[PDB]
């Protein structure tokens, strides 16, 4: 057991986002070609996965953050992180 | 220790697949723009990773499912999950 | 607890890289359409994530390798693995 990370990237700069679960929280580090900085994403969790896709120039990110009990999807669509509709079962 | 997830996405709808290892099995939840539903993928495992790529409009998915002893590659190529040639060592 | 893997792919062959953390080390298995073989990447770690992007025909890979204490970014840009600038905090 260590930290656990997830990564996604887009474009040809590129932009990179690295999510790290450690000590009960998932945080986000960002690269847009100018140096690493801390992103806005911050949620509880012990495990994280991520995927992203471009629509034209606009990035859309989905982070699947899992605590001990619940996987919550968090959505970046250019204007803040929002709770997604994802559920693990119907 | 929690559930562990992996995610992939494709297209501009987009389609998303989220694989979750929990309680000894890896299951799959799917988004094609119309709501989340449970996919056909179901294999034993404690850890999962995934990658996918498009060939034209056709998606190809590779899921790396790891039990306590073995990582098995599972392949989606439009017509069922099949065992892949992946091995961890030669 | 098992092995832990991460995967990335590119192109339409495709090429695939699967990173496996097991027994203290992260190793790499490669598919370029001709069979699986062992890649050059080998670093200590218990957890791994990966992302990659193409610039034209040239692949660029970023592997985030985490030991018990440190996440190190490793960079493939066509001519060897190099230590990346990534840090988890500023
Ligand atoms: O410009 C940085 C930022 O807005 O990029 C998109 C997301 O990664 C956000 O969490 C992050 O703060
Ligand atoms: O709100 C954005 C959303 O619709 O984007 C597609 C999927 O990620 C959904 O779970 C999510 O709710
Ligand atoms: O349409 C759903 C489905 O066929 O999509 C491709 C794969 O994700 C399958 O496991 C899944 O059942
Ligand atoms: O059968 C499909 C296959 O050839 O696709 C490419 C790689 O994923 C291989 O391991 C796999 O066997
Ligand atoms: O041709 C194989 C190789 O050079 O491909 C790029 C990287 O995955 C390297 O670690 C790997 O040895
Ligand atoms: O050296 C290559 C590099 O600049 O590529 C972009 C990011 O992965 C950086 O952390 C990294 O140092």
Residue numbers in the entry:
A (entry chain A), B (entry chain A), C (entry chain A): 1 to 90
Paper passage:
RSL is a rigid, C3-symmetric spheroid with high thermal stability making it an interesting candidate for protein-based frameworks. Here, we describe protein-calixarene composites obtained via cocrystallization of commercially available sulfonato-calixarene (sclx8) with the symmetric and “neutral” protein RSL.
RSL-R8 includes these mutations as well as two acidic residues replaced by arginine. RSL-R6 and RSL-R8 were cocrystallized with sclx8 under near-identical conditions while RSL-R6 resulted in crystal form I (P213, vide supra) and RSL-R8 crystallized rapidly (∼3 h) to yield crystal form III (P3). The charge properties of RSL at pH 4 are preserved in RSL-R8, which is highly cationic across the pH range and thus amenable to calixarene-mediated assembly. Although RSL-R8 yielded crystal form III like RSL, the unit cell had a shorter c axis (60 Å compared to 64 Å). In RSL-R8, binding at Val13 and Arg34 remains crucial to the assembly but the interface is ∼2-fold smaller than the corresponding interface in the native protein. Arg43 and Pro4436 dominate this interface with cation-π and CH-π bonds to the calixarene.
